[PDB]
């Protein structure tokens, strides 16, 4: 049973879905379950009581949204089962889980219990013929067509940098933080309350993400932007009430570089990139500096790559060619590589079959991934 396999690119922010051997994912929607706050007195209302995908995006105001995954670690397992069921259902894929093999994704250095419980869901509740779990960095390099590359990614949950060299992922050189797009959006919300405009509800939270996506930029020199007085640019809500953002637009993404702003001493994006290259072997460093690949949504800020270059120039050894590459399709880079990996004939050997899972259990899944 070797049908056209499915590529479920997981993530706390957005969940991409579709079939193998495609250019772009057809089914992209945000990873959250929406349930109504209010009472439904009047008949002919929105049925189901559980809202996932474009219905939830359309009807935010009703729904008390709650994210099942935080930092690539599913907290609420019932909510992810409903989302994965919604992905497979007639509203998106229009196919059964029994037909196609599954390509799952996870962030590196995650809890092994979550990986086991993920496999349990796909093998038992859904009846998958074969499952395979993979990393974000390996898939990003598949999409570009390279083998050598440091993959500095920045999603909604996790930021990390896996240094791969000619098809050799070094597991001990991996640097990871739990500071990313969601924490920047949460940090922007806190600033907007200090400015004046308060947002508190979960439906109301996604307005702050939309402000962060649209009107934010990274200053090349933050001390210079502090000393100077900002212009105070405007933004229109779905309501229509105007919001003067002020200095919070440039100070919000500084959480990525200075994680001491949230009050949680970590490395930072630029330090993680340097530390990943430094932890690897001596002869591999110059090739890893030349091949720096970007991916994820929190790399899309204005002047992000310019500042990320300047920080590498400050930290790294002098007179070395730094090249921070970044494709046009950064958001779907991880899905594209999964679709390419799924289309290859070697894919049949790498996966974990249902029969192999029933015999061995979790140990066989831990062996095949690494």
């Amino acid at each position: 049973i070797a049908n056209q396999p499915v590529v479920i690119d997981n993530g706390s922010g957005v969940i991409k879905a579709g079939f193998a051997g495609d250019q772009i994912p057809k089914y992209c929607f945000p990873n959250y379950v929406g349930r109504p706050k209010h009472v439904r007195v009047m008949a002919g209302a929105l049925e189901g009581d559980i809202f996932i995908g474009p219905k939830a995006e359309e009807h935010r105001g009703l729904l008390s949204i709650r994210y099942p995954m935080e930092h690539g670690i599913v907290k609420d397992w019932n909510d992810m089962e409903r989302i994965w069921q919604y992905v497979y259902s007639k509203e998106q894929l229009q196919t059964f889980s029994e037909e196609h093999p599954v390509l799952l994704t996870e962030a590196p250095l995650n809890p092994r219990k979550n990986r086991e419980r993920a496999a349990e869901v796909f093998f038992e509740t859904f009846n998958v013929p074969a499952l395979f779990i993979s990393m974000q960095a390996v898939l990003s390099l598949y999409a570009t067509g390279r083998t050598t590359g440091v993959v500095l990614d920045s999603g909604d949950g996790v930021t990390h940098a896996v240094p791969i060299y000619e098809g050799f992922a070094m597991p001990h050189s991996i640097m990871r933080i739990d500071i990313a797009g969601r924490d920047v959006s949460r940090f922007l919300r806190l600033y907007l309350r200090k400015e004046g405009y308060d947002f508190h509800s979960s439906s109301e939270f996604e307005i702050v993400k939309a402000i962060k996506e649209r009107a934010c930029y990274l200053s090349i020199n933050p001390q210079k932007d502090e000393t100077l007085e900002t212009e105070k640019a405007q933004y229109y809500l779905p309501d229509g009430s105007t919001i003067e953002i002020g200095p919070s637009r440039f100070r919000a993404p500084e959480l990525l570089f200075r994680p001491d702003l949230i009050g949680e001493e970590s490395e930072g994006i630029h330090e993680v990139l340097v530390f990943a290259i430094q932890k690897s072997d001596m002869d591999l460093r110059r090739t890893l500096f030349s091949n720096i690949v970007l991916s994820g949504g929190s790399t899309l800020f204005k002047g992000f790559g310019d500042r990320l270059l300047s920080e590498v120039k400050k930290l790294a050894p002098k007179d070395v060619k730094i090249r921070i590459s970044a494709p046009q399709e950064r958001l779907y880079s991880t899905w594209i590589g999964g679709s390419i990996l799924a289309s290859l004939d070697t894919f049949k050997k790498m996966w974990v079959s249902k029969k192999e899972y029933e015999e061995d259990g979790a140990r066989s899944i831990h062996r095949k991934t690494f």
């Binding site: 772009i24 992209c28 996506e213 790559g305 060619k321 090249r323 399709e329 950064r330 958001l331 779907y332």
Partner: peptide, 20 residues
């Protein structure tokens, strides 16, 4: 190509100049 989010005029990469 089709889909909601893209960035126009960032470029593929930012590279330092190669010396002799």
């Amino acid at each position: 190509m089709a889909d909601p989010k893209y960035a126009d005029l960032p470029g593929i990469a930012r590279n330092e100049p190669d010396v002799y």
